């Protein structure tokens, strides 16, 4: 193995939540960042491994007694407080998926496998490596199964320095217990330099630890041996009053309420401070992105069949094909307004859906892709392509089932070619609509409020559609050739009716009204080309928004 | 006071979580009743409690040596682990409104306040009793001070006999401490009988209660005074091998993890257990029902302003309404086609919006009304009735000033009288669609399952609103008469042409394909009376099937 002898001295947080603060970790060692809430255990231990930067962050960090570079960032692997892992992939499957993707692609396949495996067998997680991650809405692992998870997303990288953040936080005692013993056999059996901020540790917890660092609202109080900070807290005049948890009284005392923090900092500045002091290729990059590009979309398959695939949604598209096929049951060809209204609901359903159910792709997931990002497993363009051909690959399936339900049972233009015709528009005009969803979506991460923008932004497309309004203000016109709905619905009229020849030989013009009614709402303003080159622009245009999004954060 | 006393002998809930558990609390004694999870501590306080009955459980529970009453419910407090609380209103107007709704009506208001007030100052909530609770969503107060409200809420009633399931679950260790050190000093300075099921305290907490009772897989393992647990056990044969805490090293050997449970239980029956054995007017009903309202009415008001008139929903109004006053800016009234699609628009807008809304009325409080069912808060007649009426008074804003807007942006029919009309339409319609998402919202409690059903059933409302299809089939147009867009539509159609006498003059109509699309879509086959009293008929109905829902369960 690479040892890492960790270092860190006048290590201040000036925003402060950290002054003060030095000591060190040497390899084999179970640190312990004890410490109450606000005390900057996880602000520690996030500027430890590299996560702090900046003139907020003072002193100095070494590495191996040198300061921290990008080889060390390659050689430290952190595990953040947040478990973000994808609910729908299988532990087994997630591990394989992040070692694919983060492991170097010097390495084969089978052997970026191997090491998954062997990671899976190590942290115990062979007996659930089949069950899937799931989080708090579908069931899966545990809570330690999942941290254990997490950790080892951190681990197959292999790094000796792990600097863990609150993993038993929000654990069961018998698992947060196991978690720690995984841990200290970790740094023990492996010689990996682990570096852990324990809530509230529980006894044997306590006892695990090889060596404790505790702070006191920013300033770190005590550094040293697990089993030392009673005997050297007692020599400083500090004993418990009743059988206190080491841990619970280490805690207690950080809040300065014993029997207090000033005296006692001033005890270990002048007592303990000073004895730790002195213990001190173009084609390559083509290849790998499109290796990431396919990593990605096998990974996020699972998550896209589950959400563009949801029973709900499911339904909803049932229902909304048997209420088309009944509404308009063998609907007439002549029946001009009837087959507008039909095919403009289509448009409004098509829109609406896949816009609304894209804005939040990219909210929900903005997290995990910063988290998997600034680690370096995969770049932007890469995750944000492979989702982008997941959702075009998965957001067809329920318009193209639709279609196929309604322009049959509705009995529109016959033949197949206008049934592909027609088919190629709706897919194009979902993707359009869906593309919109991902700009908004993208553009801010709320997802309540990116839902609200593009309701509000479908609703202007609708009221510009061409078929709730027709005789427009002269300066409100121009929002309908902005409109995703409007050229589906240009498109859809255009193939049922052509040029509306025919129809126009049924009604007999070429009543003015009654010509009227079928000469603006049938023959419109758009060609059928220019709708469908528009449509692709839009499609094309708002991904490159949201990519554009993307990369503003 | 009226001091209580648990006496539970042999209490096992079959169908095991609890068997032969064997102890008593007097008045004065802070009981504990620790263990790991899934021991049984939450279900013991349960039944101990009177929240848990029938065949399930098994064996004798005594209230002052005698059988649990409907009066002793009125004198035991439960703080459930789960703290449903208003979010939008402040912790005096809480538990203010909790004294209300809680305290017999033969107290006087003043007085009822008074005591609020008091319950507010004796648990520490006087520093952040103007404080708005909040919750996840909002912020408000801190976890400690929630569960604090809580136990309030649980306090107004005054009870001697509290029980606390889990009430530091969640809580700093700070906050804890001093939720127990409340708890020790109700139990001490008001002499209540508090019993708590405490998950993992600290090693002050662990002193701070004055008794303790462990569950070890159903089984009572050690009941006994607080500081005789270390004694008693080392007497067994069981020795902290480290520095533990002693709720640690509890919850431990609960476990039965020690270098076990069997052996210790029998133990446990020899020397403890015996020890214990051996010390083993229709007039004033419609008055409450109609102060209950009123309290009902005030406590919802908040959550009401901060639904109904979300900033998101005000800006999906806001702009639903801008492009209403600019796709029909200056409509004229000869448009028939464009008139009837604005009619219809403000339909599909008003029949969705306050439908999907009202379905997670319900459901989102559910919980809550049960909580403050089962305990005597209110009956369920007047909550909901309540509730009708807040949600009535409040989801009639948005549309009162979207129509506002738009029927004097859009030229509709002029004149005070057709605005008066379509005022009452439009919020009798608004009315009706919120009652079919209330229905739909009780009939079912998931708040998505409710959504999609309402969405759908409002999709085949749209659909045969008589807008987009005319031509019906025969063995579909009975589906028109049972929509509430229909009516709506219907109704803004007669308001805005009556009989369709001056738009036929203005046609001079009696093609014939052009007079028909007229004549079938003005008018209808409804009339405006029958069309206002299947909307009133409809209103009432969904709110009956509402209740009829919320009596289900
Ligand atoms: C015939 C045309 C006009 C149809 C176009 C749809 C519109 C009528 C708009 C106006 C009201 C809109 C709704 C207003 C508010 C919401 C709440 C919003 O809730 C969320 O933010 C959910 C977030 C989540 O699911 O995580 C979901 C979209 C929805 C139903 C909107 C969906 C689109 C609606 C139905
Ligand atoms: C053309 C006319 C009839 C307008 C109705 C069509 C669409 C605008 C509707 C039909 C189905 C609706 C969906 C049905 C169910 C829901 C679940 C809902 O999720 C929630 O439960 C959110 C809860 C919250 O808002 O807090 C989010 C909106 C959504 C997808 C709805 C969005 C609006 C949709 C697409």
Redesign the interface.
């Given at each position: 193995c690479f040892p890492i002898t960790l270092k860190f001295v006048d290590v201040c947080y000036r925003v402060t939540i950290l002054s003060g603060v030095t000591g060190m970790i040497s390899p084999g060692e179970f640190m312990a960042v004890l410490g109450?809430?606000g005390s900057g255990k996880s602000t520690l231990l996030n500027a430890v491994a590299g996560r702090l930067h900046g003139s907020n962050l003072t002193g100095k960090i070494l590495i191996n007694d040198g300061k921290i570079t990008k080889q060390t960032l390659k050689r430290t692997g952190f595990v953040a407080q947040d478990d973000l892992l994808y609910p729908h992939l299988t532990v087994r499957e997630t591990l394989v998926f992040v070692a694919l993707l983060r492991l170097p692609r010097s390495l084969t396949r089978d052997v970026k496998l191997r090491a998954a495996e062997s990671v899976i067998s190590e942290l115990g997680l062979t007996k659930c490596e089949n069950t899937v991650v799931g989080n708090t809405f579908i069931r899966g692992i545990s809570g330690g199964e999942r941290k254990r998870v997490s950790i080892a997303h951190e681990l197959l990288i292999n790094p000796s320095l792990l600097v863990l953040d609150e993993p038993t936080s929000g654990l069961?005692?018998?698992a947060a217990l196991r978690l720690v013993q995984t841990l200290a056999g970790l740094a023990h059996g492996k010689g990996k330099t682990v570096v852990t901020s324990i809530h509230?540790p529980?006894?044997?917890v306590f006892?695990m630890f090889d060596t404790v660092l505790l702070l006191s609202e920013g300033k770190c109080l005590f550094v040293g041996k697990g089993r030392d900070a009673?005997a050297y807290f007692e020599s400083v005049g500090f004993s418990?009053a009743?059988?206190?948890?080491?841990?619970?009284?280490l805690?207690?005392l950080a809040?300065g309420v014993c029997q207090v923090r000033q005296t006692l900092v001033t005890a270990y500045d002048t007592l303990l401070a000073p004895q730790v002091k002195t213990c001190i290729g173009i084609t390559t990059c083509i290849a790998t992105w499109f290796s990431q590009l396919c990593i990605l979309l096998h990974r996020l398959l699972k998550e896209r069949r589950h959400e563009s695939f949801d029973l709900?949604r499911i339904?909803?598209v049932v229902?909304?094909s048997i209420?088309?096929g009944?509404?308009?049951?063998?609907?007439?060809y002549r029946?001009v307004?009837?087959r507008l209204?039909?095919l403009?609901?289509i448009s409004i359903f098509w829109g609406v859906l896949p816009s609304f159910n894209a804005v939040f792709t990219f909210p929900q997931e903005r997290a995990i892709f910063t988290r998997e990002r600034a680690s370096g497993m995969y770049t932007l363009s890469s995750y944000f392509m492979a989702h982008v051909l997941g959702s075009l690959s998965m957001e067809l399936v329920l318009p193209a089932s639709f279609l196929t339900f309604t322009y049959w049972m509705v009995y529109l233009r016959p033949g197949i070619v206008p049934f592909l015709l027609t088919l190629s528009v709706l897919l194009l005009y979902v993707l359009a609509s869906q593309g919109l969803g991902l700009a908004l979506g993208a553009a801010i991460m709320d997802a309540?409020?990116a839902?609200?923008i593009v309701?509000?932004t479908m609703?202007?497309f609708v009221?510009?559609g061409g078929?709730?309004?027709?005789?427009?203000?002269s300066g409100?016109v121009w929002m309908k050739y902005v409109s995703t709905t409007f050229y589906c619905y240009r498109l859809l009229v255009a193939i049922q009716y052509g040029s509306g020849e025919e129809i126009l030989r049924m009604?007999?013009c070429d009543?003015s009204?009654?010509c009227r009614?079928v000469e603006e709402e049938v023959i419109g303003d758009v060609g059928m080309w220019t709708s469908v080159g528009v449509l692709f622009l839009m499609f094309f245009g708002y991904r490159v928004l949201a990519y554009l999004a993307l990369r503003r954060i």
């Open positions: 109450p809430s069961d005692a018998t509230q529980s006894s044997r006892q009673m418990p009743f059988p206190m948890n080491p841990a619970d009284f805690l207690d809040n709900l339904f909803q229902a909304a209420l088309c009944l509404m308009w049951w063998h609907s007439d029946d307004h009837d209204g039909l403009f609901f309540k409020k839902s609200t309701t509000v609703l202007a009221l510009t078929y709730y309004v027709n005789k427009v203000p409100m009604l007999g009543t009204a009654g009614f």
